[PDB]
Design a protein around this nucleic acid. Structure first.
Ligand SMILES: [Mg+2]
Ligand SMILES: [Zn+2]
Ligand SMILES: [Zn+2]
Lengths: 36, 137, 100, 33, 183, 49
RNA sequence: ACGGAAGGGCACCACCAGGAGUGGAGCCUGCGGCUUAAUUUGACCAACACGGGGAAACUCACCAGGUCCAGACACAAUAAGGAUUGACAGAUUGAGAGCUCUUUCUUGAUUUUGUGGGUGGUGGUGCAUGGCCGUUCUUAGUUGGUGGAGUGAUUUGUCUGCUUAAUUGCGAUAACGAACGAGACCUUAACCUACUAAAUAGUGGUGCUAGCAUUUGCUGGUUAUCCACUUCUUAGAGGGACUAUCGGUUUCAAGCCGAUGGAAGUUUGAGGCAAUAACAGGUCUGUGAUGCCCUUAGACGUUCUGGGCCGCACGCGCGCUACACUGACGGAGCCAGCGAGUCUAACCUUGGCCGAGAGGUCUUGGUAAUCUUGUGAAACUCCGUCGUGCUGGGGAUAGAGCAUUGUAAUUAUUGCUCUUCAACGAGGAAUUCCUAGUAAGCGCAAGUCAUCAGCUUGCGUUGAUUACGUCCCUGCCCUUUGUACACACC
């Protein structure tokens, strides 16, 4: 039932193949990228 | 010269040659075929016509294919038929004829291979002709 | 001239023999030396099964049989005769294999 | 792209142009005019 | 191996037969050689259909790109006749009479199923000479079993032909029991 | 997502009906006992005795 | 067509005369009953080791939980600022499952929700069906042409009587000549000092022959050690049996009975195929065979976790062990046949190594007449002890430990060693199968198998008694007969 809130109009990690648009969510000690 | 003989599935091949009264069965002498009751069944195709009656012939037979008594019957048929062939080709046709007469007067499928073959077993029951059992009611 | 072994396997006896027997004449017409055609025993692929798709009726089993027959010949022929004898034998239904 | 891969391997089956048979469990497909 | 190899060849033959019968039904398929009641749509638009079928069979079987009187044929034709619409009894009668005048020495068509709702009956049409059964039925008889899928129910159609032993052109040329002398 | 089924009836099925029962895993058939009986003569299995 | 009508005939799905059993015990197993969350369902001579169903994941269709869409194709919705999907940080369910949530991030015109519509079902309906099988049928029947009898529907032919497995045939005869089915056909198991060809089989003459004996002779290894052969084996064309000959019985004959010959004289033994038709026989729980309905995103679709089908006051059937001296236990002798087996890889395993055993280890041979495999099997023979006993037959019953199969042996898979030797001391009324390589005893291979047989399908070793028939019973067929039945006794 994941709703995926609309996310209305708005750093970086390893694996530099990402196109500099993978700004993370800074909850705590977030060294874990959203990709993997 | 060479003959073969069978009773149910065991085939025995016997070579008879001009030699000195040596009759083997599987490498052992005829005194030690060892069914321990058919030691005279194997003696029969030699004791029938004469006591020894042969010191000039050598018969070596090799038998495989069946069971103990089946192989005994196979060898006792094969050596008798080898003797018949040896007399037919070398010794005399008359002599072959009078020994065939004795073989047929004591016929024990000695000269003719027994045609009794195991009949195929059919579905629905152990054994060819006996069927499984039903009680139903 | 090289030595070869020709193997024929099939289920159709008519074509199997029609091939294994013209091979002998194909060799003799060129006057070759060969060991005769050897018939390795026919093996039956008999398999029993239950006739009905369910469990009613008297227990009746029916067997299906697939008889596979197969021969082998030794020959001595040059590469040209080898390719000729492997090219004429394209009879559909008999598997032919040539080893050197 | 996850669909473009198959769309380009060929050279949805109900829009048209694609005849599908089963024919012993292998999902045969043919493209037609 | 050899037994496994030829078993694989046999199941591959069955695969070819089933696939070709399902796909090439519209062209009047009879059996894999391929054999169709007309040998013109086999080529089609100068080879398009056969090239497509070769491509499909290669893709399936991992193959290299470069390496009238038939019982099944008449059965599928009469299936098409029933499916696209014609009286069932009339269709069976037409099929049997056609096979009869096409030189075949005997025909039998059995149609079973829900013609009209009932307890499903079996209606038959048998003409000429037929022997069933023995070895000579494998020798000279062609049999086909077909499932007709109409909008209501399924009809089982069995078509059996006793082909003329005289015009055999292979194997025995007469009946096993045929005894004829000259004087 | 999917637990291993590298053995057993979850691994093997009839290539025709996909039935896990009646499978003939002999001679390289991998085909059901009922599909076998139906389409048997097309494989080469004849009835002789 | 049916009859709670009669008469013939046939059948070890009947008997006579017998053999071996089952029913009496334990246990494997299926069915009924009982409760459980379910102990899944179908089937009641022709159900009950049957559903090739020997159920730990899957099988499974059941119960309790957990996901997911793999809801085709249209329609409209910020969805061209975004529709959806996934996601680590954490509680959360076994689940490292973003099931959900605290929470903000990737890509972005595939999706989600509506709106139909669907797709699948081991969901029901086999009183809607197809196919297929079983039964009627380990029987035998059915049909037209010409003619005859009938106004006719129809009938005769298709039969009194004999003979056959047989509507097989003789014979009698208003029938004659025929057709399908039965026979015929084919498969196989017998033979063939005849043909064809064989280090993918076998046998003999030579050197590689170590033993014994030494005038040379017996077993003898030498798998690329030469030659030839096909008698033994293999498989292709073919031959043989057709009841042949002779006696007798035979209505007149079909046939049958004895002896001889024969390879085999009961269709040569055994099967495959098997008609005109009917069953409210079984299967929708094999089929991507299928009419109708149900379900459809809290699913009856798929999938995962655990159980379950095995369960125990009880009843029934098919079976193995069985109850002992024709025996048990040890050595000892060593004889099969059907077959199965991995080139996309872990199958049959040989020979060494370890282990008492199970089992593991180095390999090796085999894609196969080559290697397992000569299946060095059991039963059995021989030699010893046991002494006639619930014992030393039985290993039922549980515990302890030892390993492999299995991601999983708990609800003993199985094997192994030890420990108790329990019921069974020959089985009531009853009751099953069976007539010579068959009964029975014995084991082998194959299907299910990642592992397990007591099941089945084939195979072979040892190989009897009784009779060579009858209608006493049982079953069915035919004929006659009654019918107010014709949807045909539901
Ligand atoms: Mg009549
Ligand atoms: Zn990244
Ligand atoms: Zn199948």
């Amino acid at each position: 039932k994941h709703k995926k809130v609309k996310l209305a109009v708005l750093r970086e990690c390893s694996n530099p193949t990402c196109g500099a648009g993978v700004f993370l969510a800074n909850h705590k000690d977030r060294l874990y990228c959203g990709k993997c | 010269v060479q003959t073969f003989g069978k009773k149910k599935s065991a085939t025995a091949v016997a070579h008879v040659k001009a030699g000195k009264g040596l009759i083997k069965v599987n490498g052992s002498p005829i005194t030690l075929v060892e069914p321990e009751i058919l030691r005279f069944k194997v003696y029969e195709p030699l004791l029938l016509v004469g006591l020894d009656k042969f010191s000039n012939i050598d018969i070596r037979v090799r038998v495989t294919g069946g069971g103990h008594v089946s192989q005994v019957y196979a060898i006792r048929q094969a050596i008798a038929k080898g003797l018949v062939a040896y007399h037919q080709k070398y010794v005399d046709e008359q002599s072959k004829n009078e020994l065939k007469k004795a073989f047929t007067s004591y016929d024990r499928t000695l000269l003719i291979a027994d045609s009794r073959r195991p009949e195929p077993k059919k579905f629905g029951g152990k054994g060819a002709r006996s069927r499984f059992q039903k009680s139903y009611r | 001239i090289i030595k070869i072994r020709i193997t024929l396997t099939s289920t159709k006896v008519k074509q199997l023999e029609n091939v294994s027997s013209n091979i002998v004449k194909n060799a003799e017409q060129h006057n070759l030396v060969k060991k005769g055609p050897v018939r390795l025993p026919t093996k039956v692929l008999k398999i029993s099964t239950r006739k009905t798709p369910n469990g009613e009726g008297s227990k009746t089993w029916e067997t299906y049989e697939m008889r596979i027959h197969k021969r082998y010949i030794d020959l001595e022929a040059p590469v040209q005769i080898v390719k000729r004898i492997t090219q004429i034998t394209i009879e559909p239904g008999v598997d032919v294999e040539v080893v050197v | 792209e996850d669909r473009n891969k198959i769309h380009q391997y060929l050279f949805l089956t109900s829009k048209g142009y694609v005849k599908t048979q089963f024919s012993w469990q292998y999902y045969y497909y043919t493209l037609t005019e | 191996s050899k037994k496994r190899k030829l078993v694989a060849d046999g199941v591959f033959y069955a695969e070819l037969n089933e696939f070709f019968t399902r796909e090439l039904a519209e062209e009047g398929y009879s059996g894999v050689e391929i054999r169709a009641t007309r040998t013109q749509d086999v080529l089609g638009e100068n080879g398009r259909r056969i090239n497509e079928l070769t491509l499909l069979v290669q893709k399936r079987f991992k193959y290299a790109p470069g390496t009238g009187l038939s019982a099944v044929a008449q059965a599928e034709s009469m299936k098409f006749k029933l499916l696209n619409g014609l009286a069932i009894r009339r269709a069976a009668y037409g099929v049997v009479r056609y096979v009869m005048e096409s030189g075949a020495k005997g025909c039998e068509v059995v149609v079973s199923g829900k013609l009209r709702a009932a307890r499903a009956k079996a209606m038959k049409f048998a003409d000429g000479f037929l022997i069933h059964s023995g070895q000579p039925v494998n020798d000279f008889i062609d049999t086909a079993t077909r499932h007709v899928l109409m909008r209501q129910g399924v009809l089982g159609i069995k078509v059996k032909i006793m082909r003329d032993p005289a015009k055999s052109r292979t194997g025995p040329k007469a009946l096993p029991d045929a005894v004829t002398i000259i004087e | 997502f999917s637990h291993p089924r590298r053995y057993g009836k979850g691994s093997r099925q009839c290539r025709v009906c996909s039935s896990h029962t009646g499978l003939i895993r002999k001679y390289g058939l991998n085909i059901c006992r009922q599909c076998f009986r139906e389409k048997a003569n097309d494989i080469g299995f004849n009835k002789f005795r």
